[PDB]
């Protein structure tokens, strides 16, 4: 809508990607550990699925606005 170009350059920023990658990876890790708790009936495990899946939703949603890596011919 409005000037989301700041977010767009943040995703393309050399410092944005490290945060992007780490949040993706840690969200995946917490999703997996929460699932592991869920099929073992362990405390506060069912909740950890939510904090990981919402993290994954947020990371993909914000990633929706990045400039794609254009394919290179030779």
């Amino acid at each position: 809508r409005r000037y989301k170009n700041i977010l767009e350059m943040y995703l393309a920023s050399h410092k944005g990607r490290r945060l992007l990658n780490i949040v993706y990876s840690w969200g995946a890790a917490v999703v997996i550990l929460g699932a592991l708790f869920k099929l073992l009936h362990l405390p506060m495990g069912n909740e950890m699925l939510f904090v990981g899946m919402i993290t994954e939703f947020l990371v993909f949603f914000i990633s929706g606005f990045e400039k794609p890596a254009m394919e290179y011919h030779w």
């Binding site: 999703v31 009936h41 899946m53 994954e56 890596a69």
Partner: protein, 219 residues
């Protein structure tokens, strides 16, 4: 042969979703339904056990007074009870084994099964090395048609019996896997309780028809 820009992303996404998707099962209300149903199933198996152990007393009393009339009947009733009770004992021990596998070595089965694992009934049934399912299949098959060889089976007569504890399943696989593959643990105990229930019903019906045939000759 892989250089795609998005196929990698979709396979990673499917990986995440489906490694997480392994957690699913029927809702906790469904498992509670399973438990509340097989409580009544346990009540029914207890009732059938009392009923047929009761009806055995008349066979005993008749054999006390007129044994020559039941030389061909009392011994077959005794054996029928022997393999029926052996099969039910095997089922109960197997249920206890599933419960112990499910939660732990200290877990009990009657109500203390505090778990619903899917991969805790297949492991004991669909085990490639020492799966009891094949042994259960063959033993229930042995008990089947043994009732048929015990009284003159008819359609109006006990044809529904062997039509009840069958072995037929979806084309390709018998109920070694049609009753214990990837189902929640509580479902496995519930269905084994169903097996105990219908073997008790089969036993009650066959003692009923043998005692009826005894009366036919006795009358």
């Amino acid at each position: 042969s892989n250089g795609n820009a998005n196929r990698q992303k979709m396979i990673n996404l499917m990986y995440l979703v489906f490694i997480a998707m392994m957690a699913l099962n029927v809702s906790s209300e469904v498992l509670d339904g399973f438990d509340k149903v097989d409580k009544s199933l346990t009540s029914s198996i207890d009732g059938s056990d009392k009923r047929n152990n009761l009806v055995l007393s008349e066979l005993n009393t008749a054999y006390r007074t007129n044994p020559e009339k039941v030389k061909v009947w009392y011994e077959r009733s005794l054996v029928l009870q022997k393999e029926a009770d052996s099969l039910c004992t095997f089922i109960d021990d197997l249920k206890l084994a599933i419960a112990r596998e499910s939660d732990g070595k200290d877990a009990k089965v009657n109500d203390i099964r505090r778990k619903d694992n899917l991969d805790a009934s297949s492991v004991v049934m669909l085990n490639p090395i020492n799966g009891k399912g094949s042994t259960l299949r063959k033993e229930v098959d042995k008990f089947r048609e043994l009732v048929a060889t015990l009284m003159t089976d008819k359609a109006k007569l006990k044809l529904i019996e062997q039509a009840l504890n069958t072995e037929s399943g979806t084309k390709g696989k018998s109920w070694e896997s049609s009753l214990f593959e990837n189902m929640p643990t509580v479902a496995a105990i519930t269905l084994l309780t169903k097996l105990q229930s219908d073997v008790r019903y089969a036993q009650g019906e066959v003692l009923a028809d043998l005692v009826k045939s005894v009366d036919v000759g006795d009358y």
